[PDB]
Amino acid sequence: RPLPLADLARLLDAVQGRIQVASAAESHAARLQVRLPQLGAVEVQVLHGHGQLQIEISASPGSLALLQQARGELLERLQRLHPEQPVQLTFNQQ
Numbered sequence: 001r002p003l004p005l006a007d008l009a010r011l012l013d014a015v016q017g018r019i020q021v022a023s024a025a026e027s028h029a030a031r032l033q034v035r036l037p038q039l040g041a042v043e044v045q046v047l048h049g050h051g052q053l054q055i056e057i058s059a060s061p062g063s064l065a066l067l068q069q070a071r072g073e074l075l076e077r078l079q080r081l082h083p084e085q086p087v088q089l090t091f092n093q094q
Contacts, residue, residue, distance in 0.1 A: 001066070001069040001070055002070055002073055003039075003066060003067070003070045003073070003074070004037070004038055004039075006036075006037045006038070007036040007037060007038060007039050008070075008073075008074075008077070010034060010035075010036055010037065011034070011036060011042070011044075011057075011074075012077060012078070012081060014032060014034040014044050015044055015046065015055060015078060015081065016081055016082075017030075017032065018030040018031065018032055018044050018045070018046040019046055019048070019053070019081075019082055022046050022047070022048045023048060028047060028048040028049070029045065029046065029047045029048065030045075030046055031043060031044060031045040031046070032044050036063070039059065039060075039063040039066060039067075040059070040060055040063055041059075041060075041094070042057055042058065042059045042063065043057070043058035043059075043092075043094070044056075044057060044058075045057075045058070051085070051086070052085055052086050052087070052088050053082055053084075053085045053086070053087055053088070054087075054088045054090070055078055055087060055088070055089050055090070056089075056090045056091070056092050057089075057090075057091055057092065058091070058092035058093065058094050059091070059092075059093070059094060060093075060094055061093065064091055064093065067091055068091060071089065071091075074089060075087065075089045
């Protein structure tokens with residue numbers, strides 16, 4: 001299972017905002033809470049390290065299950081979003 005498009009879309013847009021904040025910031029890290037239309041409130045955290053860019057999504061238990069079912073699609077779109085380094089995608093509970 002793929003995520004609902006409107007959720008993928010908002011998520012991708014959010015992750016990319018955080019990537020930009022984290023580039024130009026001392027902590028090399030950025031985070032934001034996002035409402036996904038059906039998946040609810042989600043936290044996006046990114047950490048910009050030298051051999052990799054780490055992205056962690058934190059969500060409710062059921063939203064999580066949807067993310068994990070869609071982990072392959074999600075990794076792959078996030079990677080194409082940031083071709084400069086390998087992306088490492090992880091999930092967390094709210």
